[PDB]
Structure formats: C-alpha cells, structure tokens
C-alpha cells in the first residue's frame, strides 16, 4: 500500500521497475511501464514476462533468467517490448536473487 | 516489505533518497540510499521523528510544508517542493547537507484509527 502511494516517486527514473520470478511471472512492474509500453501495471501482474517480449528475444531474456551465464548476479541486456504507443527496445539493468525461489529485479530503459 | 528490501538497489538510480513522513512526522520509511547522502542506516532512522535529522531552523518550515493546507497549528497533486538542512555524518560536511524535498502529500492507508496524510518525497542534494 505504501509502495502504491509512493509509486509515482519512480517517474524520477529513466525507465520502469521490473520484477520477474523465476516461473516468468511479473512478480511486479511500476506504474510507469505506462509511459513506455502504454500497458497499465494491473494487465501485466502476475502474467507471463513473454507476452511482453518480441518472440525472437524471449530465449534471450529466459537465459537472463538463470543462474548460469542470499547473493545477486548482476544483469545487463537487451530485449524488445510491446509497445502499444509496434515493439520498442529496452535495455535491462539489474540483479538476478532470491522453498523460495530466484528473481530478477530490474530497471527496462529506451535506448 | 521483504520484496520491497530486495529491490531497495534499484534506487540506486535515484539522484536523492526516498523518505516517507507520516503527520505525526515520524519517518514511516527511507531507502537503503540514505547512508550515501546522510551517512545514516535505514533502520536507525525509520520510526523517529523526521525533526531530529532537521536543522532546528529549517523544522518549522517542514512543519508547515507537512501540512496539506500549508497550515500546521490549481495543480491535480498536493506538491511540495521546498528547501532543507539535515544532519549529515559524513566527512565532506559540517553535520549537514542542504537538500531539496520534491514529492506529494498523500493518505496513507495500511497502519494499525483513521488513515493520516503522509509526503512522500525525494530528497536530492544542492
């Protein structure tokens, strides 16, 4: 709830906040992938990341997904997103962490 | 609250560090990126009153700006976006480091009694 108030605060990045588990799912994605993608958060919470991707960038991003190439792998790449405002690349900046499972917690920003 | 640890990081990004007060003027939160700014720990700071990280000259101001009526006894927001001294313990400073708060006053729901107007900010450095 206090990060619902506060979401707006991320306007001040260049770029939106994702969070994916391991299983693909957007765990969490700011409001402001709006002003990106033109999707709205809620349709894209606890949906699959791929619906998101270009089909020919999503073995990349699944690859980012895992360990091999408690602590973090650091994460920095390349993927096209739908965007309905057809597709437009983004590059990924951030970390791959943590019975509980793996996540990536990321920064997708326009080139 | 522990998601929302694990992707502190992120802020990184920032220009500034994220603080929340609530009315009462504690400090509901501040991200992990206060300690680069203000050389404080999120978890020593969070809980305290915000006045104690304030220059005793600059409380009144944060007082009145906490305030939605700007009134503390035409935009689509209740924008603050004002000036302040707080208590820097790191080597670069004189115990303080004058900093721009930019945010919005806003309800905050989720404690405990009725909710309580809270600003929500970034606080950036001069």
Same mark, same amino acid.
């Given at each position: 709830?206090?990060?619902?108030?506060?979401?707006?605060?991320?306007?001040?990045?260049?770029?939106?906040?994702?969070?994916?588990?391991?299983?693909?799912?957007?765990?969490?994605?700011?409001?402001?992938?709006?002003?990106?993608?033109?999707?709205?958060?809620?349709?894209?919470?606890?949906?699959?990341?791929?619906?998101?991707?270009?089909?020919?960038?999503?073995?990349?991003?699944?690859?980012?997904?895992?360990?091999?190439?408690?602590?973090?792998?650091? &994460?920095?790449?390349?993927? &096209?997103?739908?965007?309905?405002?057809?597709?437009?690349?983004?590059?990924?900046?951030?970390?791959?962490?943590?019975?509980?499972?793996?996540?990536?917690?990321?920064?997708?920003?326009?080139?």
């Amino acid at each position: 709830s206090m990060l619902q108030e506060g979401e707006f605060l991320l306007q001040a990045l260049n770029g939106f906040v994702l969070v994916v588990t391991a299983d693909a799912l957007v765990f969490y994605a700011s409001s402001t992938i709006q002003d990106y993608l033109g999707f709205q958060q809620s349709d894209v919470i606890h949906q699959s990341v791929y619906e998101l991707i270009h089909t020919e960038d999503r073995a990349e991003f699944q690859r980012q997904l895992h360990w091999a190439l408690a602590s973090f792998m650091e &994460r920095c790449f390349r993927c &096209r997103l739908r965007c309905l405002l057809g597709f437009l690349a983004m590059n990924f900046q951030g970390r791959l962490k943590y019975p509980p499972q793996l996540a990536l917690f990321a920064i997708a920003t326009p080139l």
